[PDB]
Ligand SMILES: *[C@@H]1O[C@H](CO)[C@@H](O[C@@H]2O[C@H](CO)[C@@H](O)[C@H](O)[C@H]2NC(C)=O)[C@H](O[C@@H]2O[C@@H](C)[C@@H](O)[C@@H](O)[C@@H]2O)[C@H]1NC(C)=O
Ligand SMILES: *[C@@H]1O[C@H](CO)[C@@H](O[C@@H]2O[C@H](CO)[C@@H](O)[C@H](O)[C@H]2NC(C)=O)[C@H](O[C@@H]2O[C@@H](C)[C@@H](O)[C@@H](O)[C@@H]2O)[C@H]1NC(C)=O
Ligand SMILES: [Co+2]
Ligand SMILES: [Co+2]
């Protein structure tokens with residue numbers, strides 16, 4: 001079986017539980033994850049961004065299949081959402097999609113949950129071990145049937161024209177640790 | 183008070199207890215610390231090197247002042263040694279010195295403990311927080327009087343001509359975590 005993902009305290013990361021997802025590297029690159037709109041006058045729609053000032057907002061992982069031990073494991077497709085309320089008309093779940101002002105594929109909100117065909121895989125992410133203590137990266141490469149529209153890639157930070165730290169699909173990966181919220 | 187140094191399990195690092203001192207970064211940069219000679223036919227004297235293949239050899243920190251709670255704290259001068267036996271006629275304690283064949287100041291064996299003579303400060307190291315989870319660097323800059331011979335600097339890894347991974351004083355710092363050997 002794939003290895004369990006562990007949190008910063010070495011305990012298994014679990015589905016249905018709030019975690020902060022926080023940069024493993026401190027300083028300029030430090031910060032957890034939150035949401036923000038395009039960055040100009042429009043408030044909506046939202047994408048996933050890095051907050052440089054704090055550990056960000058709580059995130060919950062949801063399993064695709066029934067996972068009886070409730071443990072999140074390496075390189076298994078899963079769903080991701082922020083456990084917060086927002087004022088845009090969309091879910092708080094992550095997906096890969098086009099986002100205005102950003103070339104390429106962005107991690108946005110408005111994601112779906114579960115498998116129900118090709119497009120639902122655009123809401124599936126994998127968590128893989130990275131090269132720092134207790135650290136992981138997000139990777140997009142679903143193992144469920146889908147079209148070839150979105151190429152497989154790691155998730156990393158990209159500074160947009162407003163210097164908002166967007167998460168996008170790209171060759172390199174951002175390293176994160178998981179910190180149980182409570 | 184300064185914060186405790188913590189080990190990879192988040193427990194305070196203690197004086198007089200064995201730890202492996204292991205690279206925070208995996209892959210090519212991975213491995214703990216051990217000792218090796220100048221790299222040619224001579225076995226002696228020894229310097230501190232990174233073993234790329236495993237967590238290395240056990241290391242013990244010793245306090246310079248009396249530390250009642252026995253906890254190693256950030257930015258406090260301390261002594262470092264390997265808790266191993268060697269076949270060179272020197273102590274297993276770390277110090278900064280010139281080492282045969284290596285340009286600049288190297289972390290070698292043959293160190294002293296405590297504070298008798300200005301030379302003994304060349305065996306004093308500080309552990310400072312680095313920018314990765316549970317990660318730290320060694321910094322040489324003693325807080326006790328000494329000669330101006332050895333400049334303050336961080337400790338990092340340098341591949342010598344044999345590709346032996348020497349620890350030297352330099353601007354950049356190698357990030358390490360501490361793993362209790364009885365774990
Ligand atoms: C998701 O966020 C919710 C909204 O913050 C959390 O529920 C809230 O938890 C508060 C304590 O942190 C408590 O005041 C509120 O009563 C509660 N609000 C509602 C509408 O339930 C929720 O936190 C979890 O669920 C509740 C029932 C408590 O057991 C918390 O300790 C749990 O963390 C967050 N997480 C989940 C998985 O829903
Ligand atoms: C320093 O290294 C010594 C030599 O390896 C350790 O002592 C040895 O520990 C062995 C168990 O790992 C035990 O078989 C040997 O009897 C013992 N050898 C001698 C000469 O004592 C020492 O380990 C600590 O002390 C011993 C007595 C046990 O209590 C161990 O559990 C301790 O870790 C190493 N550490 C120190 C602080 O001396
Ligand atoms: Co070895
Ligand atoms: Co005297």
Ligand SMILES: [N+]
Nearest residue numbers: 036037039043
């Ligand atoms: N916004």
Ligand SMILES: [N+]
Nearest residue numbers: 218219224225
């Ligand atoms: N040697």
Ligand SMILES: [N+]
Nearest residue numbers: 299300301302
């Ligand atoms: N001296």
